[model samples]
Target chain A: PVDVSVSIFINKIYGVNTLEQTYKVDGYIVAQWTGKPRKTPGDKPLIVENTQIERWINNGLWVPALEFINVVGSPDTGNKRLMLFPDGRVIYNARFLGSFSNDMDFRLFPFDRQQFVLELEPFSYNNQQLRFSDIQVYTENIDNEEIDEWWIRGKASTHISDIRYDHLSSVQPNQNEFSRITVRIDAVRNPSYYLWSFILPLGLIIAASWSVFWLESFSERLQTSFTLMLTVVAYALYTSNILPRLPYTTVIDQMIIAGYGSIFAAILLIIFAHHRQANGVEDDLLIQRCRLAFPLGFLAIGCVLVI
Target chain B: PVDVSVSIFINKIYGVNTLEQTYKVDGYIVAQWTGKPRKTPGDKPLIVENTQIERWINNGLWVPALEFINVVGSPDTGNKRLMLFPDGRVIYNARFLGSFSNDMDFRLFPFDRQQFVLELEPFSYNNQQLRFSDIQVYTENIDNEEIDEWWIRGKASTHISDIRYDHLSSVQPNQNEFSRITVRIDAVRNPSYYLWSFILPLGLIIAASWSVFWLESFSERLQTSFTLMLTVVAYALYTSNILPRLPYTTVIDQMIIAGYGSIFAAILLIIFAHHRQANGVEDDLLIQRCRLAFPLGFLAIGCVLVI
Candidate 1:
């Protein structure tokens, strides 16, 4: 069995596709293994870069290729290198860009947190044939964490684990297990733009609509609620056009529905106050006080939705 | 004289400070030069990484340090390396993160385009002692540019030039000249979050303010203008709190002022229309038609402000 140590240096992570549940990533992959000691012109390590790494293989060098488990398709490879040590150790480094799949949870939307994963395994070797000694992954966590679209949280997590497949017809006792490395980098969505631009304005619109209760005339209060309802409709259209496209509803969607529910209830109360009278269309003072109760009711409802 | 070649591979650029006109960038800086041939154990390139580069300096390996001229302070350095070949060629690479300065013009605000520049000079050597033969820079232009806070326009521009300072007291013939490398990366501010969130709402507010002219009663007309005025005031306050701080007014600011002027002008016209009639406080039908004229007038004013 051969032991391989792997290191990943992530250069960039971007273009997260919401509908496709994919993300674009480019990084350097380093693998090292030991071999029998060999002689060199000066006993120093040889540097074979780019095309030269293939040339080194041409002279009877054995190197194994590692494939990405969750990668969507073939990766764009670049900057291949090989360091041949005189003491029979070899190091291989290569750059690659690929689209990876992840089941990101976006229920919280602007305040959502997600984990990106990358899996690596020997293309043809099982755990008994090839073993992973160690793994290290360096992501976008070196400096400030408050600037990009997504803020990478803390350090990365890596694991050199074994995976066993069970469907092979001619599987041996231990040949079904394979050595694999998994890398996880957690990140939080930056909400600055959302906080001021969308959330703040939405809040203000809801608060302003409460002014309907303060109107002097019954006609004024009832008619203004219709306008308030339409305003929320316009806002919903605005949010739908700009928000990220996803399969399920988000935190904002829940709030919009809450607003709709509150408004529909208020309309019911407003109309009922007039008809529930003992005589003609006389308003009910208790329900008219929804002015006081409407805001507090909305706040309590909002807290429950947040949880 | 020693000739040095430099190349920079920028991994990330973020945390742009609007008030300071600075941005944070981290990348690998590569320098290559040639020296006299030396014997090696196997006639191969020797790799010296991190702390070993300093250990090599203690053993009489001569290397030069390059300083960032436009940097605010000492840079955060990481991942040092020395690639030494038996044929006298040496390659040095280090990862550095720094905040660099430039004279950025923010006249266009959200739609603004900017250029980031980095200047490099030898710490203890001039052009006569050491010269820069070539320079290269790779910015965040490798992949898709649609996702980040700022989109890099294209490939970076580089220059290896000489600057001579005549203020040096002990200046000799051509001694004051120093070799320097300059890098320029052009970028545009991403405005997606701003388009729908801020500008669209402001436009809707302005359009809704014109509805004051449609009221049937004079009390409704005059009183509604006050509410419209107050709404614009609240919006201005909202904008001031969330917008990027700058010394000069932006495109949004100009529109806000234009709106204030339009409202103020309408108020004066509304008062004049009532009093300008022959009868006491009689309304003019011509002024009532200001509903049609007011919107066209505001539209014309907005067009002029855009220009």
Candidate 2:
């Protein structure tokens, strides 16, 4: 049984997708395992790269094809190498830039707790035949977290576990257990840009709509509600234009929708208060004084939604 | 003379600082040179990393200290390794993240031509003793260009040449020629975000300001110009607030300033058209008909300014 040590060096993780549930990754992969000792010039490790790796494998060199199981399509493979050590140790290294797919939950976007993950498993071998000895994952713990879009929370968490498959092409023996390397990088979205741009602007627009109650004429109040609704609709479009398309609504999306509901509800009251008196001019005073109420009401609902 | 081959694997280039003329880079450097043949376990290349590299050097390992000539300060070095080959060759590899500086021109920002560069030279050794034989620079030809901030124009251009100093600090011989490996990555700033957000909004604001001339009353025209002037002022502040602190102005900065000038000029024209007469009641009809005049005038000036 060949025990391979896999190491994944993640350089940069960005370009997160909400619709596709994918993220762009650019880095290197290194795999090392023991093989039959080979003759080398002056007994040093032989360096074989790119096209020569295929040639070496054609010449009966036992190289395991470890696959990125979660990667979408083919990875843009870069430099490929085989470090053929004379002491029966073979090291395979390659650079790759690709999109990886995993389940993404952008429920609390702009304050998200997303995890970028990479899953690796052997293509043709099972756990009993070729098991992973261990795994090491590397990443940068950057100092200026505010500059980047997403800040990596902790060191890259890694796991080496065996996955039992239920009848993999009807194997001859009990060979369904495959070794898998799971690398999870927990990251938090940098809310600085969205905070100033999306959330703050939405709050301001909602606040401005609340001031429609201060108008003396029912014409002023009702007409202003229509204008505020248009503003909220335009803001929602702005959010849609800027952010990624998701199947469901995000945090700011719901807030924009909430603003829509509040404005609509205020419009209902603006019409009801005037019509409830069987007059076009007079309105309810207590309902109009709700100007002092809804801002805190919105904030309270925000606390619950966020939690 | 020892010839060292250098390879720089640039992972990412970001965090461009126009004020300091600096950019942050994270990558790995690989230097290979033939050294004295060493003994190894089972005649394989010995892998020494980080702390052990210092220990190996303390025990008389002839490792050269290469300096990043353009680095702002000491780099955050990671995963230092020495591949002690059984042959006369030694490979030194290290991962680094550091801020590097060069002359930056952001006058055409959002469509700026910037080059991220790395200058590597031996800290102590000169060309007579140590020289760079060759250098290779690698980068990703990313498919999704709009996702990134800057798009690299070409493959990283490299130069392995000798830099001659006028004089050294009291050197015994004329040993002043240092071998330098310069890696230049020519990149263009991605103008996608700025185009949609900054330039488009500024254009719309400028267009809106011209509509102030459509108003009939001099009071209406003049009061609306004050409001437009405030909008331009606020926009200028927003531009200043968003962008990097540069000593001089960028394209957007100059454009924002031009808006200020255009609005001020309109304000001047509004007052001048009124004051040119004996009374503020009667104004020049020909001058007030400049509704069609300034937008074209601004557009023509834009051609000149952009050119």
Candidate 3:
């Protein structure tokens, strides 16, 4: 079995697609193995560039096809090189950019923690012919943490294992296992933008809505509530225009719904105060003064939503 | 120099991402070329499967690398086969799924028409070494038109030409042009859901908002307007939760703004009618009866928005 040590140097990880469950990774892959020793003119390692690698391939050089199993499409391969050592060791290096698929759950979206993963396996080769070892990750910690949307939590973790496929159209049933390498990077989202830009402004609008209860006349109180309701609608639209589209509602969406319910409840009380005359117009004064009570009552209900 | 003819059979086109300006394409690609005649096993044509194709490649067989220039990532390749005839002709067939990038303008958004495109070119080889000829598309009409978000407007279109790149690292300066194939599929979005679920409900709420003016007593008139305003806000939040997020405003967003402005205007008029008169107790009779005029006036103003 040929033992190949693989090393990955991650350059960037961006374009996290929630709907497609995909993420783009840009990195360099290095695969090294021992080959038959070659005599170089300078008694050192021979550096074979792109143009000369094709000639070496024509001369019966073995190049293993290491494929990314979860990659969405084909990877964009950049510079390729071959380092042929005098001591019979060879290293193949290439830069690649690929979009990989993962099973990501974004149920707690804005406050979610995700792990970006990559899987590498030898294509068309069984475990007996090719085995993976010494899988190293060269990912570094983020310095300018707040500049990006996601923050890297820790150093990358890697694992090397054997994967067996049950459904391969092969003559032999036992020769289905292949050596594979797995790499994972954990990250947490910085929700400061959504909080300050979205939640803060919404809170102000909801607070302004409570002021309509303080108006002196019943005409003034009722008429002003409509404007508050309209203001809440405008804010909802503004929030919608900025947030990501999803199949289900989010925490922000729930808050907007609460704002709607608050205004609607105020409407029911205002109309009831005018019509309900058990203790005469004096009873209307008690209900109107309950405007102060509504804000405090709403706050209690808001705390319930947190739980 | 070898002349290659290509044909593509499109199976599906879906998942158009507005933010990324990318679309997914799934299809089969076929390339045919004439080679030197060879004797087969029994004077019959040779059919090389996936396993045997690599053996042929090891024996110095020439295969040109064709790449999709506009593809976002790598393509997911499926089955591959080679058909070789004794009369000196060879055909290569493969199935691929790719995400291709395009310059899309979504200013008209819900009413916008778009063309998903694919650009293919020979990698590492110029036109003189490997020239492209007759290109054909075999895409059929989409079935169950209303079931999908996008409706295909026409059959796929294909064109074969030469593209010249300005920058290339070469000793010989004038060899920068390469053979290329371009494919395009035109499609239109179905805006029925947005109109019915969004615009219809919003129209009803605005119409109901006008009922606040008909209530007797200045207190009832003003108090009821606040509830109507709150209703408009609630509807706006509901609409925002479902719609797609964009950088700029949409037709639905504008309607929501109008709802806010309409209720705010009513508040201004309601307060003015009660307090504007010189008499301490009585309000203006003509202005309070303007319940009929405002709806018509709002409709006239709404018509101006369409222009």
Candidate 4:
């Protein structure tokens, strides 16, 4: 039997399956186990098979089961290495696939938190039976790494736990016999994707959404905004496809609602603002400028939003 | 003691919380058991407290602890009545809070399937001693009563079982002793919320999204679509906020992406359609007419989205 001391570095965890009562995780697994001192046979390292590794779990064994629940395409499993020391220490090193989770305020989604996590477990140990000492989670800088599907930058966040489950099988027999160690990491907003891919382009769209208010006649203004309304709706559907869904609204969604409201409001206002005059033919530069002003005001609101 | 037969009626159920491993449900509870065969000393009935309810559960007096893990809001307990029969049949008439579980696609969310469930126990019984003879999950429509939050129309869906928990106590423990009578009701999609709140309005928006392609000049076409792009982004944010989050894309979200592609593609084509000629000023009514045709084509696309 190997005495393994494991420390899992979590990148993120999310995508909970309520029906299954399961959550997806992403991160790296660092396992250090002790083996009998040995001499190299023909200078070749010993090989470990996935089946034998799995057997360790079936016979009163424990190994953290980690999955990349929402990885783009599939998770990238990086370099693999195994270190064997004459002093009986064996370390397994491999990069990972992770899905980060956070207490995202999806109320403003398309702009929410992304959490990363790492799960750790002894290949097979009852709770408290295997003691993990000198466990540390490293927060390495991922900036400037080769650009891949997802960019790994500075370490965003971290969390650790020795969890116990009661609802399922108490494998340890004793209520607290089994223990599961978990680590979590968090990252700040990588607005690059949203900015270049979504925000900048979106600004142009909203600008167009506002142009309906610029049309000359009531027919043009009113009818144009109706089309504008449809445009916003279509864009909304498109956005909904790419972004994660949540209970509340997101900044982008708010913008969409605003787009809808702006045009619809423009419809009512263009009619009212124009016809509310003396002879029904009076032109109000102030009102026209106010339309321009409202657009500016919306910008002001946008600026203030960052603060 | 009185003996009363209880039957629960489930109307509709659906909605799963992936993160929390929780789901939602809407149903009615019917519980009938025997009580003391004596009439009220006066003309009134007997009363019970929540504490008494708890005491009964701890004593191994089976009260099925049915938890509503993903209920959106606390359900209103309809009515409370105790029917006392001279033949020793006693029934408890009260509504409840319940959450049912099911495999939800959510790939077309804003359009989904949900299950309603009712968990039952003797409030204090063990084994199959208190088995239900039959169960009815009503799905038939009552007169069009618009007063309720959910309308229960047509025949009901139903299922019954004695669910067993394997990991309880120990492997040596009797599995039969750890079972509860579980009842479930399933329903199809209503699509009302998605149609009225999401689809129809979105059609109008997509129509407007395509309009940016119709502007007279290159600058107007390009610059105008930028605003249209922003409108899409805003709508995307709103959609992400309100809908459920998932790994793969959904139909609605795909539509949003399509809208983005449409506008961006239009931006590219508009530039090409305008400057691809000599003197940098050849007008292509054919291409421009195609741009106009996109909006109408989108309507045709909308009609095809049904089902």
**Fraction of native A-B contacts kept, per candidate:** 0.00, 0.00, 0.25, 0.07
A215-263: candidate 3 lDDT, tens digit per residue? 8766666666667767767776777667665434457767776776677
iRMSD (Å), candidate 1: 10.8
lDDT of 3 at A46: 91
Model 3 lDDT on a 0 to 1 scale: 0.73
> What's model 4's lDDT at A131?
39
Q: Which of candidates 1 and 4 is the stronger one according to lDDT? A: 1
True contacts kept of 3: 0.25
lDDT of 2 by residue, A151-243 (tens): 888787777888885522223567678888888888888889999999999989988888988898765665555456556646755776677
Q: Write the per-residue lDDT of candidate 3 for residues B102-210, one digit (tens) a residue.
A: 9887766567799989888888777433344332333345655443567778877777777888866663667877888888888887775465445655775676577
Error of 2 at A102 (Å): 13
Question: For residues B5-25, could you state the per-residue lDDT of candidate 4 as single tens digits?
Answer: 446544333344644445544
lDDT digits (tens) for residues B1-307 of candidate 1: 6888777766566567779999877666778878887776587566665545777799888889888999997886655667787889788876677888988888787789999888888887884233343334433464544435578787787777888878987767668878888888888876754655556666666665665555445666666667567656766765665567889988888778876877788788777777888988687758867777878887876678666
How high is the lDDT of residue B137 in model 1?
40
Provide the lowest-lDDT 10-residue window in model 1 chain B: B128-137
Q: How would you encode candidate 4's per-residue C-alpha lDDT over A52-88 as one tens digit per residue?
A: 5434334423333222222322245566455555665
The TM-score of candidate 4's chain A against the true chain A comes to 0.62
Task: Quantify all predictions' global Cα lDDT against the true fold.
Answer: 0.72, 0.74, 0.73, 0.51
Docking class of 3: incorrect
